[model samples]
Target: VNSFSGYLKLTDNVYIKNADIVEEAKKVKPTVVVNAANVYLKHGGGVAGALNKATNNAMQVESDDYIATNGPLKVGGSCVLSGHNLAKHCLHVVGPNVNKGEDIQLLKSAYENFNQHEVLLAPLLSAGIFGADPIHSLRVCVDTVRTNVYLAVFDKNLYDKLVSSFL
Candidate 1:
């Protein structure tokens, strides 16, 4: 059930897939798993919540530690931390809240700002509660990421939509 339904190559090694990002992150054990987070890095719901639940809240603890040390993560900025049980590291990136009139450039920056890990597992940033159009977000992801990456999708309809758009 966790198997990929479809994928589209972005480049020689880079690709995006219609699958559960967290499950794929666990399977690949990538150098970093990208969490689409809010500026507060709360990990309360969506991909962040799923990751927090999977790691038994270790990620949230680290996130709190990060905030205590560095303050709130800026929109479009990222911070790397231990992935605990999931991967080598978790790259927390805050995307733009489109409902607030934030620009797509911030979402692009969120996708662009991570460290150059050997392998990365990422979700479609800003496409959920942040309110960016899924296709537009997917386009930004494809445009910004030039190295190896697996774009994880959890919603079947969204996955199908992406498949229709790209595959």
Candidate 2:
């Protein structure tokens, strides 16, 4: 099994780590695993794809049903559903697309919405295809989440940056 390469205590309850998010989540089994999703909530690529694949596509099926019934999720909005093989639940959060002129607050809102879970495993929301600066996204995550949080990072460069800055 993969392991955390770097770790830091952000607060009394919150923490951050550099590791393979999907593998870590599968091992830790947090209450929920947060997906950095689009407004469409499609699990096509990137973190969404990895989580969907790890969950055996159950998340995509549930997401399709959710969208069919409730319509597209709004930016900064979130929804929770079965995590299938990964965890008990998956919290799909729609982060702002920087290409669409959406700013950091929407990303911050996405982080804020994760507060309800007792244990949460999340990636750097909007740092991939959504286009938010990775460091900024990391900072927002560090600043907002209050529960037992594990910021699962995948990029080696970003992991190095996080360790240098926060560890």
Candidate 3:
């Protein structure tokens, strides 16, 4: 059962934009309310509640590029993180262990395939795990964590949009 039940696809393969961020939270809701758990946390680190908070499961949304949370998101949530994340819409990204001193190739692959759909947000990157090819890890995934939205955990981590857009 350790094997993935399905193929690893890209994040953009099925990205969902939140139409309303106000429901999950509001800028003026105050820290007390903001800290409340609106959606129940699901397994594999996913937050599930409803589409616009209406369904028993969870849904998607599209907003003005601003979603902030004091905790982790659910497993299948496709969200766009925006604005002043460290006071400037920047999330501190770190990668898992990549072979040291020879990660330029991965970096090269990243640049070579930066716009290739949406890239998966590696847990290694999120949890500060290091890898042998650190640069390659940083090349696209970690370095470009801003725009590359991973809708699901199964989203492909390494891919080339240009090459993928076609055969």
Q: Find the candidate with the highest lDDT and give its number.
A: 2
| Number of the top TM-score candidate | 2
Tens-place lDDT digits, model 3, residues 77-159? 22222222111121112121143333333333332222332332222122112233322333344344444432222123323
Clashing pairs in 1: none
> How much lDDT does candidate 3 score?
0.26
Residues 1-167, candidate 1: write the lDDT tens digits. Answer: 22333567666645677677778777777778888888787999888999989999989888898889889988898888998888888998889988878877887788786436656788888988778888888777767776667788889898778767762
Relative to the true structure, candidate 3 reaches a TM of: 0.19
Q: Candidate 3 at 73: error in angstroms? A: 33
- Residue 6 error for model 3, in Å? 23
lDDT of 3 at 132: 35
User: lDDT score, residue 153, model 3?
Assistant: 24
Of candidate 3, the 10-residue stretch with the lowest lDDT total is 30-39
TM-score per candidate: 0.89, 0.89, 0.19
Q: Model 3, residue 100: displacement in angstroms?
A: 9.2
Off by over 4 Å in 2: 1-6
Candidate 1: list runs displaced more than 4 Å. Answer: 1-6
